[PDB]
Amino acid sequence: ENYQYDLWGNDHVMHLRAPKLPPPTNEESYNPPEEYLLSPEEKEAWENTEYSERERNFIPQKYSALRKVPGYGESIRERFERSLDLYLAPR
């Protein structure tokens, strides 16, 4: 019988701030315009640069077909970083 009762039917305090949500997407389409396809020279710089101090966490690519879209194993790391930031934000 759990979760069988309505609970309703908070950050206004000056010393409390709400958790800011992440911004929208940054044009990471699986089939984006060729302009978003970063050049190899700039892609090399993106790869070489350190982590967590990068403009983007991804390299947009022009995939021929939807069925050719690969997986994304870095989503776990991004979610872990978001979880860390949620409880490690000195508001």
Binding site: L21, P33, R67, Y72
Partner: protein, 334 residues
Amino acid sequence: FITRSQAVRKLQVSLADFRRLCIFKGIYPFYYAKDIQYLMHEPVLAKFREHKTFARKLTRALGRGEVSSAKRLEENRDSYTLDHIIKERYPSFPDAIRDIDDALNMLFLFSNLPSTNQVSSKIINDAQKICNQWLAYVAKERLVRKVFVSIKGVYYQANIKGEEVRWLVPFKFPENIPSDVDFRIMLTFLEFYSTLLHFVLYKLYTDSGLIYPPKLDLKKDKIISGLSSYILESRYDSPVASLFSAFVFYVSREVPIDILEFLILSCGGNVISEAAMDSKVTHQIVDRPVLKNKVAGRTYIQPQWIFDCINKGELVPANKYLPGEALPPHLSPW
């Protein structure tokens, strides 16, 4: 402020338990003395102390060589509840709906996560069930408005009470779990979000006059288990929800039936899948570079057509969505 070690000593609780309590209460830092002092009155601390006492007693019993006593102790034990902690952090339902973004993201990420030593298969199954319930509710209400297939995944946006909450779902491909991420911290968020989503789903079902939790179609659960297999029993706003009304589509093997079926159901169409085998369709969703069937009774289309139609609500002509030709560029809907 009081140092983290000072706060832990004042709470005389384990570091992992202290982190769990901080995550549950949303405390942030080097923490304010008043907040830590108030947190000491939470019943969760008493539950953690009871858990520690039970753990030591069970270790004693097991070492002594009495399995029956340990089994009896485990059976009588009960887990703590987060029902009341939710209300204080989210006094109003709209706040919970607004915050549901991270909860949905984490639940969907964990649903596709393969079973591992860190997380038992029961948690993954519960997350998958919660995701199925949420998807069924969204499809019934036809609240999907924005679809953006990306490298990270497909960015969904459900207009639950007009809050247009944006959530992401990763692909179904296997994921190589990195060792950098600590699942212990993520598990607390998983549990909190699971409880919050359970409560929110119950509230939504009650508001919509639907019995919760609905059962799952067994015959479908042996073939196309997922969103479609979760049948719901009770007892327009935008053109997007009205597109493909009374339409039947044939999804090919290559296409992600799981992603397409949800969108088709939300719009109001019907899905017939070849994989389910392992007739009266106006369109067939195929991704083969070249197809040999070529039946005039079916209008072959690509998923980009449905994506663009949902994003813009246009029902755009299929002049640039035939098989074997490049699709138009896909842009961010926001």
